[PDB]
Amino acid sequence: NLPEHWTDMNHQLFCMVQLEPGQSEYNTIKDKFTRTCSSYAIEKIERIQNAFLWQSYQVKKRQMDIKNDHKNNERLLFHGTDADSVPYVNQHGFNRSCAGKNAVSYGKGTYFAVDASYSAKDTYSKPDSNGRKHMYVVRVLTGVFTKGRAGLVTPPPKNPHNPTDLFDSVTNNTRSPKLFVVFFDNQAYPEYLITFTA
């Protein structure tokens, strides 16, 4: 069920595809980034074609679309990371067990930002030895969310008398969400890698 606009991968399971400025695909990601990161400049944007991560993510999306009934369950969010983590994330996606404690913790999970400006902080997108910073653009199954708390290892129950029926994600603020935390594998697909510099 691989998307028809992906490059042919020749029975291979992984490929990074360099995008061309002037194409709508490149320009919409550039605009989404520059909305809050006008001071930085983009070196390049790569489409991540990971067949296995895509399959698992799409199975979780279809399950959450069934479970939630007519919710927009998916948001396009940002995740800054260090150069050392980029090969693992490209192949294996986002592992909560590898996640750094956030300066404002709303739970022990993987953090995704609404604003590129947040992920552009040196604390998340650490400049490598050549001054390159790295930010993923990520399909995240935010589903139905509530304000998190520092102690969470899973999203909280919607109802305390039904502890197993969980929120899909948590946020910093349900009125004005600026970040989302997810606690399960295959709940985020890294779709694009932005390489950028000051």
Place this chain on the structure above:
Amino acid sequence: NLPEHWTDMNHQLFCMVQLEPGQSEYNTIKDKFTRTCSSYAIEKIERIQNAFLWQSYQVKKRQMDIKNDHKNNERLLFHGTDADSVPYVNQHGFNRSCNAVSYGKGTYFAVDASYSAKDTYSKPDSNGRKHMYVVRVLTGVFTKGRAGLVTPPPKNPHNPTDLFDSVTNNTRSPKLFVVFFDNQAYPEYLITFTA
């Protein structure tokens, strides 16, 4: 693609089905337990019919069968748990974020029911009832674990992203397996028993 031996769920996606004693499915699961736990009393065995967990597990199985270029990635293993964790596991399966973790920070599965039957794992409830899962685990290609692992090690440190599927206490004669990812383990049966 819901298995043959599952019974009708009336268009629902989750059911716990009590097995009939004396029929093949019950007898098969009873014998796997009684191989090392003949001194315990089985109160009941339930088949876990969780369509979402099953689907995510079968996708991983298909992926691991392609990656390893053969089948034989699956083992039937035991997991003891406290009564309060049973509803979570039935619905969401096994969560590494939730005892000793000497071979890594993953979910632990025993080759022998007798290991899972220890009170430290299958903690007796108020009434003395103990709980153990029979689990389909995608052990795949495994190596020896060690303390502090958050994922299995690489097969070759010249390709750090190509990983073993699981780790064990002992590669020649394993008695436990640790997996580090959601949906590498399907809880298939729950055994309620006493000492």
